[PDB]
Amino acid sequence: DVVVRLPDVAVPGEAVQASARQAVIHLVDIAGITSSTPADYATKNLYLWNNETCDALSAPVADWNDVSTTPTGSDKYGPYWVIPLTKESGCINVIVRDGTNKLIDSDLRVSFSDFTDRTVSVIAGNSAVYDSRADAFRAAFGVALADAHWVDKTTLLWPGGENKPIVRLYYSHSSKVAADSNGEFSDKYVKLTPTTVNQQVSMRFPHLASYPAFKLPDDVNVDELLQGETVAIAAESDGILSSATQVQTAGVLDDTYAAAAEALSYGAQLTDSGVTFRVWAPTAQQVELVIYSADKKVIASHPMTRDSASGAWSWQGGSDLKGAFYRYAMTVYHPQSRKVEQYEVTDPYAHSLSTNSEYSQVVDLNDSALKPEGWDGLTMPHAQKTKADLAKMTIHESHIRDLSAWDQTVPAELRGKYLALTAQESNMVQHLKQLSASGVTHIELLPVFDLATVNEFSDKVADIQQPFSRLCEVNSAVKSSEFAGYCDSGSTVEEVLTQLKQNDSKDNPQVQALNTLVAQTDSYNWGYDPFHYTVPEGSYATDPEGTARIKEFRTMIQAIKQDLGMNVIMDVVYNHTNAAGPTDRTSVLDKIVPWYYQRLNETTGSVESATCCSDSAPEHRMFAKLIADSLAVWTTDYKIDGFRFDLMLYHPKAQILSAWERIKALNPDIYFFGEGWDSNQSDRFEIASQINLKGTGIGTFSDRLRDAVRGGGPFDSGDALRQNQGVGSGAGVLPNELTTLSDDQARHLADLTRLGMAGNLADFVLIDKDGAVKRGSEIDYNGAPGGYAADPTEVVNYVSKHDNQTLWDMISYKAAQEADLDTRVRMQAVSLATVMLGQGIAFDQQGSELLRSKSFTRDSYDSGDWFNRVDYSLQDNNYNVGMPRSSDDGSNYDIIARVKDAVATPGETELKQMTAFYQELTALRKSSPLFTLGDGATVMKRVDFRNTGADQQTGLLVMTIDDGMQAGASLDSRVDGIVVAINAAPESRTLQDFAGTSLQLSAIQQAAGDRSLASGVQVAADGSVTLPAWSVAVLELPQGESQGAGLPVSSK
Ligand SMILES: OC[C@H]1O[C@H](O[C@H]2[C@H](O)[C@@H](O)[C@@H](O[C@H]3[C@H](O)[C@@H](O)[C@@H](O[C@H]4[C@H](O)[C@@H](O)[C@@H](O)O[C@@H]4CO)O[C@@H]3CO)O[C@@H]2CO)[C@H](O)[C@@H](O)[C@@H]1O
Ligand SMILES: OC[C@H]1O[C@H](O[C@H]2[C@H](O)[C@@H](O)[C@@H](O[C@H]3[C@H](O)[C@@H](O)[C@@H](O[C@H]4[C@H](O)[C@@H](O)[C@@H](O)O[C@@H]4CO)O[C@@H]3CO)O[C@@H]2CO)[C@H](O)[C@@H](O)[C@@H]1O
Ligand SMILES: OC[C@H]1O[C@H](O[C@H]2[C@H](O)[C@@H](O)[C@@H](O)O[C@@H]2CO)[C@H](O)[C@@H](O)[C@@H]1O
Ligand SMILES: [Ca+2]
């Protein structure tokens, strides 16, 4: 077997050697094998200058604009420069250029001690200095990238080995694989041979199925090779290296250890009789369990016991370890750094933590001391068993700080804390209590698992309610900013921001300028930055040290379900981690089992960031297990009723379903839903998207009705934000001065809205804008089939959410100048009516009932208490409180300045008016089982629409729900049918469709009088119904002695 070595004969020689008092620099640039003339290097030049570090340069030409330092000469291997030196010692500063641009960015320092002959060579885009053109030429023949994949015991997929006489897998336990001084690779290796990828590997990794396959000997000691670095190397029959790359081992890790590891349980598993610690680390060379005292002093370090079959490490001790802090000391090779790292890491299965997640803690969640009184008997206030039960789901998407950060009626020590939900006398809790009584059924919580983006050490944080002096002491960026003068003032940050409002504008966005600095060290963040998946966040607890947060979190859950009467949904973010690699403080999973828990680029091995951050790999067996095990704890130990999967689309459909099967065994009525957009991961596996999840029972947010009612889309910027009016803001019927929307375009949005109100079903049949008969799947949504679901319970409709601009801000961007304040409040209610009175599950942003504004901020995740403010004292809706963050909304400053002051900012009168409209809508939603049929087939048999086709009155939505003899059994003893009429237009409209039918206005709306969305509606003696501008009316056919004729769905 020939020894592999770097090129040594077919290598470029030296153009010239540096003589006395001079240096020489070669720019390796070999011409084509077909070249016939000397290459042109007239534009090639060097920028020479000497400073403190290097002053050997003799008379260095200044002025960067000078390009006169061109090549002294050139040959087939590139040009070269003869630099006049002042001495043959020290060094020189050089930057290779091609005119004015840099061929090599980084500054180059040529050390005369490193290269005695003062004759070096460099290459474009390398930045490294070589002693010869030959060495530089060989540099391209070293270990680079990581496009070789060891997918199973004996299969290695690597493009670089194709048609290569010598293909080997070199390995080193404690060293980095690299050619020695002789240019040879003396490290040990195993021979590879061309083979054909098996169906097994093909099915597991479809995206790698076309890669050249190589077979390892069956007697290969996989375990030992996985303990260190492995490099795939290829060379010619003569032993000259062709290429060498790093190896991605996730596949072989699953094939070798997954099954055995899946059968075990992880974390610090404490029982009253003892404790067993277990962590999966199949590639680690050593793992020690480090025990810390309360004061964080090492009490003991225990070498753990490795299980050969699973690659898991365990240690068993006594029950006295209850409450102890701990970390796992790892000795493991990390492919990113290429070295055997040594570091302590918290437990990925941690269930308790110290302040700021620095140490994990041993805990038994079953302990009565960690449970509020009566916890075990806590019941779910709303049923989720049948589809009809699920359809009644009406969600209020909330955030811990958004809820109480500004409520002065919430005790000061509970503001921004889980416990604020227990302050029964506060404006916030009383408000939620009334929303519940009116029909809101679920509270959805933005990230309450352990996030990383808020420092849990209180002395390291400064909030706007505190002195500016505190902000300066904890934030050095502020102290060195233009705001430094406020440091020794006597004002609070909030007071300063308030004073900056008058002079704030697109030309001087000073409010956001200061707030951007504040955001770095405040207590605010949505928290889509996972540090630990199965421990509550610490900053939301009154005491973040230890187990305390567990009981407080439970107390909150109990308060919501028992005292507020609502179910609880948790936002989970298993699609990515806060960080990866061997150095970041928050990298947990990627430190323990490098390159396994993250999804990597097939060629470079780099952790992908499509989610925003450090993409995870739910397709890998042990991560799928971690996810399922985590959900089990939130379900059983925290009694969560449902989960909203953030970026669920980055998860395999099969993984989400498997997790659901596992959790249903714990809570048979648990509900799963999430964002099912397109993750572009279809080449790797079938994704959990709106389309692929049809008929599975897993819900997905629908962007159809959302965009049709709000107007436009999430990618709009500039004037498009105003031009793209929606059904809720008068598309077609009340055009603003910039829009060019046609009647046809407006009617298309109405088609999408009606389809959504019927549950966005693929098979629901309706009459479209042109009078044509169409199935939901035939109504187009930006190029894709509109209706995608099998049952309405698989669809979550909404017109506002934490992401993107609030509904009020959108209406402010789109409303015609002539639409007065009162009309805009009704537009907000009309927009929400399409969701609340529809068959799909209803979802809404906390505060929509208060016309919530973020001062036009599109993505407010780190915009603090200021832009995310919700005033439960009802003074205003937080509109017009300063221009939004310039980094992301700066391009919208012009349009904002133009539309912002069209009308007055909402006050208590408007907020009370909107809350009334909102509670009327939610009360109507639950006033009859007809609004929430649940089953798709039933929706198709009972739901229909009027005012459709080419002769329709634009903006008028009329939906009928049959309960008559032709629909089947009477589901509502009080009525034979219901009519939902939403007149989203500035004209009064008269319905003649129900003449001689004895229609009556809902008792709930009648009770509200002139405060009803139906105020002014008239039901004439001839049976005609007239609706005022921007109104919503729910009419009913009273049921007599027996079931009536109802409102049968028309044959189409
Ligand atoms: O590195 C990835 C990107 O990360 C950052 O983007 C953020 C956005 O700023 C957030 O707003 C949010 O994005 C949401 C988005 O607001 C929401 O509308 C939705 O997008 C859907 C869309 O609604 C739907 O109709 C259809 O078009 O599919 C879209 C998704 O393809 O979901 C988004 C979720 O991403 O979160 C992302 C982070 O993921 C960063 O700002 C970007 O520069 C970066 O590219
Ligand atoms: O840390 C390395 C990475 O740093 C940078 O990423 C930034 C993004 O550019 C920011 O946009 C932000 O990401 C936020 C995002 O702005 C916010 O909207 C939220 O996104 C959620 C969304 O709300 C949710 O509904 C759903 O769509 O999922 C989204 C993603 O979870 O949360 C994001 C994460 O906090 O912050 C990150 C981190 O600083 C840099 O741009 C990256 O290239 C780099 O990898
Ligand atoms: O003048 C010494 C100075 O040279 C270089 O600075 C360049 C810079 O790299 C260019 O991008 C552009 O800005 O022109 C500068 C010179 O005018 C080095 O980068 C710098 O370290 C060095 O001090
Ligand atoms: Ca040399």
Ligand SMILES: [Ca+2]
């Ligand atoms: Ca945290």
Ligand SMILES: [Ca+2]
């Ligand atoms: Ca912040």
Ligand SMILES: [Ca+2]
């Ligand atoms: Ca990809």
Ligand SMILES: [Ca+2]
């Ligand atoms: Ca009935």
